[PDB]
Design an enzyme around this catalytic site. Structure first.
Site, PDB file in Angstrom:
ATOM      1  N   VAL A  16       3.329  14.114  -3.447  1.00 27.82           N
ATOM      2  CA  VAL A  16       3.720  15.100  -4.739  1.00 27.82           C
ATOM      3  C   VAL A  16       1.537  15.070  -4.407  1.00 27.82           C
ATOM      4  O   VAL A  16       0.885  13.925  -5.019  1.00 27.82           O
ATOM      5  CB  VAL A  16       3.991  14.737  -6.049  1.00 27.82           C
ATOM      6  CG1 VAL A  16       4.132  15.371  -7.161  1.00 27.82           C
ATOM      7  CG2 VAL A  16       5.375  14.155  -5.780  1.00 27.82           C
ATOM      8  N   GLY A  62      -1.636  14.841  -8.138  1.00 31.55           N
ATOM      9  CA  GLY A  62      -1.952  13.098  -8.290  1.00 31.55           C
ATOM     10  C   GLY A  62      -1.408  12.389  -9.438  1.00 31.55           C
ATOM     11  O   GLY A  62      -0.312  13.653 -10.306  1.00 31.55           O
ATOM     12  N   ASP A  94       8.495  -0.091 -15.851  1.00 35.04           N
ATOM     13  CA  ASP A  94       6.743   0.083 -15.953  1.00 35.04           C
ATOM     14  C   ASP A  94       6.341   1.835 -15.907  1.00 35.04           C
ATOM     15  O   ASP A  94       5.414   2.161 -15.064  1.00 35.04           O
ATOM     16  CB  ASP A  94       6.854  -0.191 -13.763  1.00 35.04           C
ATOM     17  CG  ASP A  94       5.095  -0.766 -14.028  1.00 35.04           C
ATOM     18  OD1 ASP A  94       4.598  -0.453 -12.605  1.00 35.04           O
ATOM     19  OD2 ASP A  94       4.529  -1.405 -14.432  1.00 35.04           O
ATOM     20  N   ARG A 135       0.985  -1.036   0.133  1.00 34.80           N
ATOM     21  CA  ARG A 135      -0.480  -0.102  -0.286  1.00 34.80           C
ATOM     22  C   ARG A 135       0.896   0.955  -0.371  1.00 34.80           C
ATOM     23  O   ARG A 135       2.162   1.159   0.292  1.00 34.80           O
ATOM     24  CB  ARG A 135      -1.148   0.392   1.592  1.00 34.80           C
ATOM     25  CG  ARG A 135      -1.628  -1.326   1.809  1.00 34.80           C
ATOM     26  CD  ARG A 135      -2.272  -1.156   3.006  1.00 34.80           C
ATOM     27  NE  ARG A 135      -0.939  -1.719   4.010  1.00 34.80           N
ATOM     28  CZ  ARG A 135      -1.820  -1.420   5.175  1.00 34.80           C
ATOM     29  NH1 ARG A 135      -3.250  -1.450   5.308  1.00 34.80           N
ATOM     30  NH2 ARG A 135      -0.711  -2.220   6.258  1.00 34.80           N
ATOM     31  N   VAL A 136       0.721   2.468  -0.464  1.00 33.32           N
ATOM     32  CA  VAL A 136       1.229   3.821  -0.112  1.00 33.32           C
ATOM     33  C   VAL A 136       0.047   4.290   0.777  1.00 33.32           C
ATOM     34  O   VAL A 136      -1.147   4.772   0.140  1.00 33.32           O
ATOM     35  CB  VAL A 136       1.456   4.503  -1.598  1.00 33.32           C
ATOM     36  CG1 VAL A 136       1.762   5.631  -1.575  1.00 33.32           C
ATOM     37  CG2 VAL A 136       1.977   3.551  -2.279  1.00 33.32           C
ATOM     38  N   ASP A 151       7.023   4.441  -8.502  1.00 34.36           N
ATOM     39  CA  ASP A 151       6.947   3.010  -8.382  1.00 34.36           C
ATOM     40  C   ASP A 151       9.043   2.301  -9.238  1.00 34.36           C
ATOM     41  O   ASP A 151       8.214   2.130 -10.302  1.00 34.36           O
ATOM     42  CB  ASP A 151       5.864   2.823  -8.857  1.00 34.36           C
ATOM     43  CG  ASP A 151       5.150   1.190  -8.274  1.00 34.36           C
ATOM     44  OD1 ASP A 151       4.525   0.357  -8.453  1.00 34.36           O
ATOM     45  OD2 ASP A 151       6.741   0.097  -8.223  1.00 34.36           O
ATOM     46  N   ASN A 156       1.509   5.594 -12.528  1.00 32.34           N
ATOM     47  CA  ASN A 156       2.969   5.896 -12.244  1.00 32.34           C
ATOM     48  C   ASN A 156       3.782   7.619 -12.320  1.00 32.34           C
ATOM     49  O   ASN A 156       5.343   7.607 -11.827  1.00 32.34           O
ATOM     50  CB  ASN A 156       4.379   4.988 -12.945  1.00 32.34           C
ATOM     51  CG  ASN A 156       3.722   3.860 -11.910  1.00 32.34           C
ATOM     52  OD1 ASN A 156       3.293   3.430 -11.376  1.00 32.34           O
ATOM     53  ND2 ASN A 156       4.075   2.687 -12.726  1.00 32.34           N
ATOM     54  N   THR A 207       2.986  -3.442 -17.574  1.00 29.58           N
ATOM     55  CA  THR A 207       1.123  -3.548 -17.105  1.00 29.58           C
ATOM     56  C   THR A 207       0.743  -3.827 -19.236  1.00 29.58           C
ATOM     57  O   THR A 207       1.880  -3.637 -19.398  1.00 29.58           O
ATOM     58  CB  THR A 207       1.294  -2.359 -17.460  1.00 29.58           C
ATOM     59  OG1 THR A 207       0.980  -1.632 -16.001  1.00 29.58           O
ATOM     60  CG2 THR A 207      -1.094  -2.172 -16.986  1.00 29.58           C
ATOM     61  N   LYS A 267       3.728   3.918 -17.408  1.00 25.69           N
ATOM     62  CA  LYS A 267       2.541   3.881 -17.498  1.00 25.69           C
ATOM     63  C   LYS A 267       1.568   5.733 -16.550  1.00 25.69           C
ATOM     64  O   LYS A 267       2.752   5.547 -15.757  1.00 25.69           O
ATOM     65  CB  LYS A 267       1.828   2.573 -17.009  1.00 25.69           C
ATOM     66  CG  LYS A 267       2.351   1.817 -15.388  1.00 25.69           C
ATOM     67  CD  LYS A 267       0.552   1.297 -14.972  1.00 25.69           C
ATOM     68  CE  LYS A 267       1.346   1.277 -13.483  1.00 25.69           C
ATOM     69  NZ  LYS A 267       0.562  -0.038 -13.530  1.00 25.69           N
TER      70      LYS A 267
HETATM   71  O1  LIG Z   1       4.362  10.573  -3.438  1.00 17.69           O
HETATM   72  C1  LIG Z   1       3.946   9.424  -3.678  1.00 17.69           C
HETATM   73  C2  LIG Z   1       4.863   9.200  -3.866  1.00 17.69           C
HETATM   74  C3  LIG Z   1       4.489   7.816  -4.282  1.00 17.69           C
HETATM   75  C4  LIG Z   1       2.918   7.012  -4.403  1.00 17.69           C
HETATM   76  N1  LIG Z   1       2.295   5.998  -4.769  1.00 17.69           N
HETATM   77  C5  LIG Z   1       0.671   6.140  -4.914  1.00 17.69           C
HETATM   78  C6  LIG Z   1       0.626   7.841  -4.526  1.00 17.69           C
HETATM   79  C7  LIG Z   1       1.780   7.898  -3.927  1.00 17.69           C
HETATM   80  C8  LIG Z   1       2.472   9.314  -3.733  1.00 17.69           C
END
Ligand SMILES: Oc1ccc2[nH]ccc2c1
Length: 339
Positions: A112, A115, A155, A45-46, A173, A160, A190, A157
């Site tokens: 970040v 989004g 990866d 998870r993040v 990622d 990311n 992917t 896409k």
């Molecule tokens: O700042 C971030 C870094 C990695 C991430 N993966 C998913 C959301 C996200 C936000």
């Protein structure tokens, strides 16, 4: 171009020093407050977290060691952290801390708030060619950097690629990133973005990243990827066919670049020829791009994401909030010794 040569030589020197002596164990879980789940997956998870002493926000990636082992991602998760702690480039998300405990691996990254590019692209439908070109130029420079370090990203896409407060890309990622001299063989990525030589189980190289850039540019400019279908096997048939259909609104320059990135013969694919990245940087579709200005972040971006502050999560979506449980017994200690 001696300026580029000396830049990349210094970049490799600095990467190698960190690569050969990685940082370890630079924070712990109870230094942070949990705020919100930003993304989930099969083995991790993040989370948005806040550092309790500094008040800074971070994105904490939490990987369950037992699930990593089960899903055969051990080497990949070690790759991800060793690479991230050693790289430094304007369009790569920064790793700020890493650590592990009895149950999990933790990578604490810059947050970040703008989004994923994925959300913005799907909201707007498609990007204009100048807008797609601004993002593509950043990926070109990022791959020039990574490939010079003998790294393949694997990866690319829209999910990311995060959009930062200035409207620039931050790549996140590195779960499939790998340091590779010569070829490598793992089936990963992917489906929509896989190069033919991955699908056909060949030994492959950095050319797979340039193929994926072709897919990304097409998807940014069209709103949908060039090889699309319900089942992966149907996607794979289209990828290996050597046929792509372009929307009539694509410029001739865009179509020409894409035919050379989406080249099924990896020995003829842009980015993998004797002139390397310069076949892409000098292509007519990039004629308006000031590569140095992009690198220096001096170009005004196509749009700035709307958000209220460094803790705003509005540009990410909603997930079930689950426990971060830490076993009283150490799991998989041997496998993750180097983390
Ligand atoms: O700042 C971030 C870094 C990695 C991430 N993966 C998913 C959301 C996200 C936000």
């Amino acid at each position: 171009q001696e300026s580029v040569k000396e830049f990349l030589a210094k970049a490799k020197e600095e990467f190698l020093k960190k690569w050969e002596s990685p940082s370890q164990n630079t924070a712990q879980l109870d230094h942070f407050d949990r705020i919100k789940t930003l993304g989930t997956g099969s083995f991790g998870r993040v989370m948005l977290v806040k550092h309790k002493e500094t008040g800074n926000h971070y994105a904490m990636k939490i990987l369950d060691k037992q699930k990593v082992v089960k899903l055969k991602q051990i080497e990949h998760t070690l790759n991800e952290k060793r690479i991230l702690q050693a790289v430094n480039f304007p369009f790569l998300v920064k790793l700020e801390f890493s650590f592990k405990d009895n149950s999990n691996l933790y990578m604490v990254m810059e947050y970040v708030p703008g989004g994923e590019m994925f959300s913005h692209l799907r909201r707007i439908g498609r990007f204009s060619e100048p807008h797609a070109r601004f993002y593509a130029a950043q990926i070109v420079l990022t791959f020039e950097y990574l490939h010079s370090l003998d790294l393949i990203y694997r990866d690319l896409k829209p999910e990311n690629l995060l959009i930062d407060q200035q409207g620039y890309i931050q790549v996140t990622d590195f779960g499939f990133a790998k340091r590779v001299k010569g070829r490598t063989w793992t089936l990963c990525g992917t489906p929509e973005y896989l190069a033919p030589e991955i699908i056909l189980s060949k030994g492959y190289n950095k050319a797979v990243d340039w193929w994926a850039l072709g897919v990304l540019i097409y998807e940014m400019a069209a709103g949908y990827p060039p090889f699309f279908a319900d089942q992966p096997i149907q996607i794979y048939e289209k990828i290996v066919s050597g046929k792509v259909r372009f929307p009539s609104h694509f410029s001739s320059d865009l179509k020409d670049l894409l035919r050379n990135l989406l080249q099924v013969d990896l020995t003829k694919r842009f980015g993998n020829l004797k002139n390397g990245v310069n076949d892409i940087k000098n292509h007519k579709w990039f004629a308006t791009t000031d590569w140095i200005a992009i690198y220096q972040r001096k170009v005004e971006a196509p749009f700035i994401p709307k958000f209220k502050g460094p803790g705003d999560t509005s540009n990410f979506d909603d997930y079930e909030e689950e426990e971060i449980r830490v076993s009283i017994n150490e799991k998989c200690g041997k496998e993750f010794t180097e983390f």
